[PDB]
Amino acid sequence: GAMGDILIVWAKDVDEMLKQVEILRRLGAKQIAVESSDWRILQEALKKGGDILIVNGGGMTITFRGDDLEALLKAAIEMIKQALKFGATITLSLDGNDLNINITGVPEQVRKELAKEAERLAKEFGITVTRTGGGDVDEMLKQVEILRRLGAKQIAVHSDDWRILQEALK
Amino acid sequence: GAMGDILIVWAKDVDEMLKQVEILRRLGAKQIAVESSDWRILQEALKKGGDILIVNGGGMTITFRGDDLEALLKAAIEMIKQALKFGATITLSLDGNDLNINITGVPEQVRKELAKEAERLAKEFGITVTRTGGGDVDEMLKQVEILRRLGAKQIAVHSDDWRILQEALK
């Protein structure tokens, strides 16, 4: 349409993803790209008729959950200051009682440190945390091949994530 | 390649963009998508041989600049807490002495409030700030048409940005 050709949906939950894709279709969206650290969410996006997927190879999504938003924000603020100082690109959103943090562009050693800090910050502020992605480069190569076999036409990667993975593959 | 078909570059500066595209090409990248709030950076990406562009229609990029990183972070933290509470999706990175904040998925009235708060926070912490994007929907429709005339094959929009613009166009 006049506004563009492709809509990018960041999918943090399989049901919210399907709900978002349906709302955009009813608004007349023709092509929808789905981004997720969760391989099952990307597989569900293909099954629903999508074929452009945005993968997170070497990074991860940290999701803080709790009823006190100011406590989610205190945990997230610490993750942001540390991730930025290490040279990460970070994406944040609020989703019900969840604060989602997509982190790309840091090496595996730094990713492991950030994942540990996420567990500690969750304890400090009395909230829960889940990590999605951050698998080895070999498991990513496997999951990407599976998406292609399931009918993915275009797979996109953030350039910082891709450079970390090439440095790791070398 | 085995890792994907498209690399996404977030371009906050025209020279860094051209430097990043060249580094990725030398690493053997075939297709590079460029994302920017700056229409001139997207025009430069087309001229350099790219044809997939990611536009920011109704949102904006806030860039804090200063030598004290802890002062950039204090300003950015306030922008993050407010933007998230209003339901924005936010992307952050450090670029030399700059902290870049991409904000999408808030209506024009909230965008104006965030832009003002950015000016105030910059004064409070003794740093500078520049805003890119947040133009009316009509100026976006014009700039998108200009990218298509300059040879853009695929234009992508964040789904939250696109929904704000459709609600505004209604």
Ligand code: NA
């Ligand atoms: Na702390």
Ligand code: NA
């Ligand atoms: Na303040």
Ligand code: NI
């Ligand atoms: Ni992304």
Ligand code: NI
């Ligand atoms: Ni983006």
